[PDB]
Amino acid sequence: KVFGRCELAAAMKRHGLDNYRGYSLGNWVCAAKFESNFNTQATNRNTDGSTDYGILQINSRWWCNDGRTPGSRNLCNIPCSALLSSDITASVNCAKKIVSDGNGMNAWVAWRNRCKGTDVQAWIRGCRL
Numbered sequence: 001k002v003f004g005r006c007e008l009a010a011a012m013k014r015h016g017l018d019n020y021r022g023y024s025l026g027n028w029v030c031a032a033k034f035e036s037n038f039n040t041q042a043t044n045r046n047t048d049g050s051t052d053y054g055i056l057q058i059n060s061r062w063w064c065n066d067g068r069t070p071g072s073r074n075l076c077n078i079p080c081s082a083l084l085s086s087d088i089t090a091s092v093n094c095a096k097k098i099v100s101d102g103n104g105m106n107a108w109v110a111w112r113n114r115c116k117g118t119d120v121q122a123w124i125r126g127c128r129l
């Protein structure tokens with residue numbers, strides 16, 4: 001599923017991301033835009049052999065199981081394919097664990113390089129929330 005901008009802000013708000021670990025909603029929408037273009041089915045292979053999955057491009061080196069990432073962990077206790085659902089629940093719940101891991105949203109290099117320090121509230125401007 002390719003979400004609309006406001007559609008995804010609404011879903012993320014419902015799932016409790018607005019100000020989660022102090023990151024306002026727009027940070028999450030900005031991250032999703034640059035990670036996946038709001039596409040829940042996005043997958044991208046990493047140099048190390050892990051893969052990133054879903055709207056927030058959550059990696060199989062640490063967070064999910066895809067059966068093909070040797071030495072990896074599954075700290076979200078989910079199959080990586082759960083992160084590809086049209087329903088963002090599993091991506092959200094796993095993102096909550098990730099952003100609590102020590103480095104906040106810096107865990108998403110795209111957030112750090114494309115959203116951090118910018119006017120992230122633009123990403124929810126206009127939306128009925």
Ligand SMILES: CN(C)CCN(C)C
Pocket residue numbers: 034035036044052057109110
């Ligand atoms: C994961 N971010 C950094 C890029 C998303 N696609 C192009 C892999």
Ligand SMILES: CN(C)CCN(C)C
Pocket residue numbers: 033034035036037038
């Ligand atoms: C899609 N990602 C990987 C890059 C930026 N988009 C949103 C235009």
Ligand SMILES: CN(C)CCN(C)C
Pocket residue numbers: 122123
């Ligand atoms: C920062 N700006 C360009 C993103 C919000 N738009 C797409 C409504």
Ligand SMILES: CN(C)CCN(C)C
Pocket residue numbers: 128129
């Ligand atoms: C839906 N319209 C009436 C706005 C109310 N909330 C969502 C801000």
Ligand SMILES: [Cl-]
Pocket residue numbers: 024025026027120121122124
């Ligand atoms: Cl915001």
Ligand SMILES: [Cl-]
Pocket residue numbers: 065066067068069070071072
């Ligand atoms: Cl594996």
Ligand SMILES: [Cl-]
Pocket residue numbers: 021022103104105
């Ligand atoms: Cl933080």
Ligand code: NA
Pocket residue numbers: 060061062063064065066067069072073074
């Ligand atoms: Na894994």
